[PDB]
Design a binder for this molecule. Structure first.
Ligand SMILES: Nc1ncnc2c1ncn2[C@@H]1O[C@H](CSCC[C@H](N)C(=O)O)[C@@H](O)[C@H]1O
Lengths: 326, 205
């Protein structure tokens, strides 16, 4: 079982109260959505997900609360149109809970293809066939050139060995099609000496497969999570009430940066991890930020309790960024 | 060029040659004795000594010329000058004796003043800074201001907004608008100036 990550913080943060309408742009399993419909019995809630399996869960769970929860299906970009059909263009949503990442059910079910450990079709697509033409991870690896595929790994996977892990994929695909998760994992391992398979470690300091950065990289290029995250936040702002509390959850750095640089106005094209020294050097050259539209409830990113991390290691990297619209 | 660097451009000016010798300075006397030893390029077909020669209108005609069709370009020019003159003779006969004094009927005076009202004093340059583009204001040389006035006027008349209107009617209408400090081309001048004022703090780049 997967407990909703930081459910206690997200509930306190949004303080759901009677007379307030809320949105959920990532229903998924619905653990967070259900934790929010428990504290306040008079709450109004809206749900959304990219997975039709997740949208069916919400529809089945809608029986528990007939109108307090309203289920919707679609991507972040398509969310505004879907909600615009309802007619809530101003929205006046008190809070938008934009949980991020892959659902526990999505990656616990081997058929969905998200787990390298198990053997499933190399789908790695949050979409559940709602768009049967949407390329899957298998398609991405078999088509793109080394330079193109290396960029996917480098930019989205934070993978130092992008050229080494991409060349192995290019050679492997020629010999046979890459259609299964384990088939890819073995190819990526084959780019390195056999001992490399578990040399790398996580921040938890527990050995991880040497292809855990290629499964994350493709997952984010197949589902365009990063570009869809920028529109998703923007749409929330337009549909978010003034004085309404937004709450995001970033499990990896790339998504965390966008949430940080969006709630603070920082340009998305600035250099990453800028030090104070570099900031001085940057502006010294020019010598020769706009008003913020948010009020961060908690100034610094929250993180899961160390005890809770061991119980749910999947959510160890959950960085909660809360803000109030201005 | 088929002219060697030794070839000098011809000076087509009747007055310059009839000027008496006594009025000449010792510097101007040297220039005249020097040119007698220099090679001179053949006069181009464009410019002559005619009293009706106008270098500004000849330049505007070339900026309107498409594919070397000078006959058509010049036809449009003279049709515009005739259309401007007829519009002013119509405004003149319909006016009172007092207003008639303020009505200009010379199309060359209107053409010149119409362009001078469109010349932008200051312009902007697209500059790159830190992977980001920001425009920078800069003074404009005299050549650039005159060229931009003629390019904005010709561009406006070629705009697709005008539906089935012939060029001599479009250009004549725009020239008379600019002659009165009104029109789209005058707005383009004002917008460029107003933008060059909002980027004054970027003048140090
Ligand atoms: N661009 C996008 N638009 C909509 N839903 C998206 C999305 N990217 C990811 N999702 C979905 O959002 C969820 C995030 S992970 C699951 C979190 C959810 N609160 C839970 O009950 O556990 C997944 O269901 C995922 O498929």
């Amino acid at each position: 079982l997967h407990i909703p990550v930081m459910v206690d913080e997200v509930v306190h943060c949004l303080s759901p109260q009677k007379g307030q309408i809320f949105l959920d742009m990532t229903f998924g399993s619905g653990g967070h959505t259900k934790a929010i419909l428990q504290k306040e019995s008079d709450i109004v809630l809206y749900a959304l997900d990219r997975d039709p399996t997740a949208y069916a869960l919400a529809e089945h769970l809608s029986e528990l609360y007939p109108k307090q929860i309203r289920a919707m299906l679609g991507q972040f970009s398509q969310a505004e149109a879907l909600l615009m059909k309802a007619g809530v263009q101003p929205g006046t949503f008190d809070g938008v809970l934009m949980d991020l990442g892959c659902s526990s059910m999505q990656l616990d079910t081997p058929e969905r293809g998200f787990s390298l450990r198990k053997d499933g079709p190399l789908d790695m697509r949050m979409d559940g066939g709602r768009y049967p033409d949407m390329p899957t991870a298998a398609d991405v690896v078999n088509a793109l050139d080394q330079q193109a595929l290396a960029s996917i790994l480098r930019t989205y996977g934070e993978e130092k060995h992008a050229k080494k892990i991409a060349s192995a994929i290019v050679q492997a695909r020629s010999i046979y099609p890459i259609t299964r998760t384990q088939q890819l994992a073995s190819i990526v391992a084959g780019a390195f000496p056999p001992s490399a398979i578990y040399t790398r470690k996580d921040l938890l300091q527990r050995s991880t497969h040497i292809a855990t950065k290629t499964f994350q990289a493709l997952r984010i290029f197949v589902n365009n999570e990063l570009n869809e995250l920028y529109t998703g936040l923007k749409t929330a702002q337009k549909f978010l009430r003034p004085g309404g509390r937004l709450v995001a959850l970033s499990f990896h750095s790339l998504e965390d940066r966008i949430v940080k640089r969006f709630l603070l106005g920082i340009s998305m094209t600035e250099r990453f991890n800028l030090s104070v020294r570099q900031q001085v050097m940057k502006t010294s050259q020019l010598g020769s930020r706009a008003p913020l539209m948010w009020e961060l409830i908690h100034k610094k990113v929250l993180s899961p309790q160390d005890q809770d991390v061991q119980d749910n290691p999947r959510g160890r990297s959950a960085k909660l960024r809360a803000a109030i619209k201005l | 060029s088929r002219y060697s660097p030794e070839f000098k451009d011809p000076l087509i000016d009747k007055e310059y040659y009839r000027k008496p010798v006594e009025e000449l300075t010792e510097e101007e006397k040297y220039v005249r004795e020097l040119k007698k030893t220099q090679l001179i390029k053949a006069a181009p077909a464009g410019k002559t000594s005619s009293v009706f020669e106008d270098p500004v209108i000849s330049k505007f005609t070339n900026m309107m010329m498409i594919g070397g069709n000078k006959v058509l370009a010049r036809s449009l020019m003279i049709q515009t000058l005739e259309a401007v003159k007829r519009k002013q003779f119509e405004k003149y006969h319909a006016a009172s004796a007092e207003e008639q004094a303020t009505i200009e009927r010379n199309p060359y005076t209107i053409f010149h003043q119409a362009l001078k009202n469109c010349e932008p004093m200051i312009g902007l340059v697209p500059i790159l800074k830190g992977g980001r583009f920001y425009q920078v204001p800069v003074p404009l040389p005299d050549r650039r201001r005159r060229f931009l006035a003629m390019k904005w006027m010709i561009t406006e008349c070629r705009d697709k907004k005008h539906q089935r209107t012939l060029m001599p009617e479009k250009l004549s209408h725009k020239l008379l608008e600019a002659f009165h400090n009104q029109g789209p081309v005058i707005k383009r001048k004002h917008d460029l100036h107003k933008m060059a004022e909002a980027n004054r703090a970027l003048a140090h780049y």
